[PDB]
Amino acid sequence: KVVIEPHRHAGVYIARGKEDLLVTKNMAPGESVYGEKRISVKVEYRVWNPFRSKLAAGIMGGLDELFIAPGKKVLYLGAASGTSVSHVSDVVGPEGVVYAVEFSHRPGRELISMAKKRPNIIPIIEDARHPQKYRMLIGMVDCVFADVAQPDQARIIALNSHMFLKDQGGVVISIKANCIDSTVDAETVFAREVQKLREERIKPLEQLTLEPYERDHCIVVGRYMRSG
Amino acid sequence: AVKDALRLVHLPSCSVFSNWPTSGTPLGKVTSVAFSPSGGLLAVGNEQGKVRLWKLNHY
Amino acid sequence: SLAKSPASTIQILGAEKALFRALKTKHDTPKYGLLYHASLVGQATGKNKGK
Amino acid sequence: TQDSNYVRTLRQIELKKLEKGAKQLMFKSSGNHTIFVDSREKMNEFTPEKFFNTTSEMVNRSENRLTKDQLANASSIMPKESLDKKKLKKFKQVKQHLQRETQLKQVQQRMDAQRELLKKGSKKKIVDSSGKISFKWKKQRKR
Amino acid sequence: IKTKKRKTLKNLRKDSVKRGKFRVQLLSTTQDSKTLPPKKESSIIRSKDRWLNRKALNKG
Amino acid sequence: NPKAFPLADAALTQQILDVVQQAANLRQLKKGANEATKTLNRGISEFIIMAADCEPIEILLHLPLLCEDKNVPYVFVPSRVALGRACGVSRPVIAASITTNDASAIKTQIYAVKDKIETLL
Amino acid sequence: XXXXXXXXXXXXXXXXXXXXXXXXXXXXXDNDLSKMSLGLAHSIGRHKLKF
RNA sequence: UUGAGAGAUACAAUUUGGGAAGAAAUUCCCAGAGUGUGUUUCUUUUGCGUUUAACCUGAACAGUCUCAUCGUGGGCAUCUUGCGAUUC
Numbered sequence: 001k002v003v004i005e006p007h008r009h010a011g012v013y014i015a016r017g018k019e020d021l022l023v024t025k026n027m028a029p030g031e032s033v034y035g036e037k038r039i040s041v042k043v044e045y046r047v048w049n050p051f052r053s054k055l056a057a058g059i060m061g062g063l064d065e066l067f068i069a070p071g072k073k074v075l076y077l078g079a080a081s082g083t084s085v086s087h088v089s090d091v092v093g094p095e096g097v098v099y100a101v102e103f104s105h106r107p108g109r110e111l112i113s114m115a116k117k118r119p120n121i122i123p124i125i126e127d128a129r130h131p132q133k134y135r136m137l138i139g140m141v142d143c144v145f146a147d148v149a150q151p152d153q154a155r156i157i158a159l160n161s162h163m164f165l166k167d168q169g170g171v172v173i174s175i176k177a178n179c180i181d182s183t184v185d186a187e188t189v190f191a192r193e194v195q196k197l198r199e200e201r202i203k204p205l206e207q208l209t210l211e212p213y214e215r216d217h218c219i220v221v222g223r224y225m226r227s228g
Numbered sequence: 229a230v231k232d233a234l235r236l237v238h239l240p241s242c243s244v245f246s247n248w249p250t251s252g253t254p255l256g257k258v259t260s261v262a263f264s265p266s267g268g269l270l271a272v273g274n275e276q277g278k279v280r281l282w283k284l285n286h287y
Numbered sequence: 288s289l290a291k292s293p294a295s296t297i298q299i300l301g302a303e304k305a306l307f308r309a310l311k312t313k314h315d316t317p318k319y320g321l322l323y324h325a326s327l328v329g330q331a332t333g334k335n336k337g338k
Numbered sequence: 339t340q341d342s343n344y345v346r347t348l349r350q351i352e353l354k355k356l357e358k359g360a361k362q363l364m365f366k367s368s369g370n371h372t373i374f375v376d377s378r379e380k381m382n383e384f385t386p387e388k389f390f391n392t393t394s395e396m397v398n399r400s401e402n403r404l405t406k407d408q409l410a411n412a413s414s415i416m417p418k419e420s421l422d423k424k425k426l427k428k429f430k431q432v433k434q435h436l437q438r439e440t441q442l443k444q445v446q447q448r449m450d451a452q453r454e455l456l457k458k459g460s461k462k463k464i465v466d467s468s469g470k471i472s473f474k475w476k477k478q479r480k481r
Numbered sequence: 482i483k484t485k486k487r488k489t490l491k492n493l494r495k496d497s498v499k500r501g502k503f504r505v506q507l508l509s510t511t512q513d514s515k516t517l518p519p520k521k522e523s524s525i526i527r528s529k530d531r532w533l534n535r536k537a538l539n540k541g
Numbered sequence: 542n543p544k545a546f547p548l549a550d551a552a553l554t555q556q557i558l559d560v561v562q563q564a565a566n567l568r569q570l571k572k573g574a575n576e577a578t579k580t581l582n583r584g585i586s587e588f589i590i591m592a593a594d595c596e597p598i599e600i601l602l603h604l605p606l607l608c609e610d611k612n613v614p615y616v617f618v619p620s621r622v623a624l625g626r627a628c629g630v631s632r633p634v635i636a637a638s639i640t641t642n643d644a645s646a647i648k649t650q651i652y653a654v655k656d657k658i659e660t661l662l
Numbered sequence: 663x664x665x666x667x668x669x670x671x672x673x674x675x676x677x678x679x680x681x682x683x684x685x686x687x688x689x690x691x692d693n694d695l696s697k698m699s700l701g702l703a704h705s706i707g708r709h710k711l712k713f
Numbered sequence: 714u715u716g717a718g719a720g721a722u723a724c725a726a727u728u729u730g731g732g733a734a735g736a737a738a739u740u741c742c743c744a745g746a747g748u749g750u751g752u753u754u755c756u757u758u759u760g761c762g763u764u765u766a767a768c769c770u771g772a773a774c775a776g777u778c779u780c781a782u783c784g785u786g787g788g789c790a791u792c793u794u795g796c797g798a799u800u801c
Binding site for chain 8: 341345383384385386387388392393394395397398444445448449451452455456460461462463464469470471473474
């Protein structure tokens with residue numbers, strides 16, 4: 001009845017019906033992590049809402065090399081209430097484990113409740129500003145994710161870039177200009193933050209500006225070179 | 229702003245006096261109030277032009 | 288989820304069937320709700336069960 | 339007051355169906371997607387067909403840009419016309435709710451301004467130079 | 482003729498080539514970025530320059 | 542309170558409480574904590590003014606929880622007796638909410654204050 | 663605190679060594695190590711912000 | 714009818730890459746660019762003139778008493794024919 005299509009990224013799928021929709025397999029049925037709908041065709045499949053997750057808009061925006069894979073491990077900064085890591089957990093499957101980092105407590109409690117229902121999602125309630133506060137728990141993750149709203153966003157990833165990246169491993173950086181300037185064009189911001197990442201051994205490959213989902217945001221894709 | 233809007237406050241008890249001013253106490257839009265230094269008199273202006281004068285009978 | 292609701296929707300948290308009948312047709316909203324079985328509304332009498 | 343609940347309720351019927359309606363619907367994206375390339379002659383020899391290793395149609399559409407190696411709707415009835423019409427209507431339904439709700443809010447906004455004329459206070463009848471009538475209550479602390 | 486070749490030098494100096502729905506820029510060289518502080522932005526320094534060279538004070 | 546977040550200074554508070562006093566003249570202002578919670582769910586709220594010295598402070602902390610979901614700006618003016626007197630009401634008011642009316646004469650002066658509140662965020 | 667027990671300590675270049683040290687945890691091995699790592703994370707947060 | 718810069722689009726000449734079809738030339742399809750003209754956009758430099766402008770506010774609606782709301786009666790259909798809105 002419902003046509004289902006493999007997406008070019010593994011784990012991601014796109015369901016086709018009367019209305020088009022972006023979707024993902026689940027690890028555990030019988031649960032809505034944030035009250036999203038799901039389709040069951042038998043194999044369960046779960047929608048991504050692109051206006052709530054920037055990575056969801058990053059895929060559907062059209063993105064060449066998302067480094068998140070099934071077999072790979074992926075670290076996550078900015079896991080506020082776990083709305084996106086339960087999509088990241090459901091795209092890595094059981095084999096990949098996801099490291100979710102958050103500093104805020106009241107949305108962090110939802111992430112504590114979410115680790116009880118997911119084997120991949122483990123929480124990090126420590127500060128992402130100082131990575132050695134949680135150095136013992138994580139080692140050599142393949143690619144990381146940024147969703148933090150701090151202005152030193154090239155700084156906080158760089159301290160997670162040296163210590164936790166697999167070498168020649170990818171990086172995903174989500175930047176808003178509303179964090180940083182709110183006075184100049186968002187294009188002018190993106191030249192400033194790309195040059196910041198070349199100072200920290202990240203060679204950026206592509207950037208994609210989410211135009212219809214969030215205002216003036218971005219995603220930045222790079223490869224962390226020649227450091228572990 | 230509003231007509232007939234002078235209110236007296238006793239001290240130190242911070243109680244507004246209740247008997248005066250009544251409803252029928254002609255004031256007008258009070259724009260200028262003044263006390264006597266010595267005799268205890270009270271002079272209240274208006275907008276109509278009529279400075280209507282009282283006497284605090286204690287003093 | 289309950290504390291994010293205002294005060295006036297904690298009155299009528301139970302009586303939702305008689306509420307949205309009374310708004311969709313122009314009528315009078317129920318005034319107690321599930322709060323009516325508190326020990327304190329019963330201590331009042333008359334219209335004071337509303338207040 | 340009963341009028342400004344029935345309009346107020348039917349607005350929230352229409353606004354909560356705006357969220358349930360947009361949640362199923364899919365918006366194709368149009369954003370800037372710049373590719374950073376190390377050398378200017380690799381830059382001059384760029385082609386979207388080569389870099390994304392796609393072909394004709396898989397360049398321009400962003401929902402599924404699949405590999406030519408990955409390549410190695412008629413199951414739904416009438417895929418060219420009927421399905422694409424019923425693809426369009428789910429927009430046009432929630433297009434109408436957004437046209438219904440914003441029309442229905444203005445019925446409340448002109449009713450709530452009428453309901454706030456009855457209460458207390460001293461009101462000033464002003465007219466703008468455009469001709470629209472609004473009021474300005476006097477600066478007076480209601481007790 | 483003399484100015485027509487300068488405009489084509491801008492087609493050598495440019496780096497952001499648009500490809501329809503896309504665009505492609507290039508990373509600059511590292512040593513040109515490291516050994517030199519980045520260039521003064523106009524929208525700040527004109528605000529300095531216009532303000533001191535203002536008609537409201539009778540300079541010159 | 543240390544639970545207070547973004548708390549306006551002495552300067553911006555005079556600008557915020559002036560707009561409150563001009564929105565209560567246009568009757569564009571819903572008053573109180575249990576009514577500012579309403580205008581968030583209807584979405585007709587421009588922004589949310591709240592008090593800081595309310596004892597206990599926890600009775601209005603759900604509004605920073607609610608505004609983060611619905612992306613509506615919010616600050617803390619320091620004292621609830623102040624926001625009460627600037628709102629036109631004899632009782633102290635601990636949370637005030639500016640509604641949305643685009644026909645308003647004060648629309649320009651709201652968006653000047655609204656930009657300063659999103660500046661603190 | 664490592665400088666208090668009669669031995670030297672140094673840093674600022676061991677991050678590449680700590681990379682190989684974190685690569686060595688796979689060498690001593692891997693999945694069951696993460697399950698010990700899981701309940702470590704599951705307890706160290708739940709102690710902090712909860713209960 | 715200043716100087717320059719960038720963008721969009723219309724047009725013509727012309728090219729890039731990818732796919733099939735033809736022995737090659739050639740064919741069609743898809744994606745993309747620069748050049749010539751017309752148009753249009755915003756930002757900037759300079760010349761001359763001008764030094765205030767706009768908005769708000771304080772006791773700023775009211776004795777030809779003002780406004781609100783519910784009704785009644787009449788007009789305007791040779792049409793303010795009247796939106797839970799304000800036709801007089």
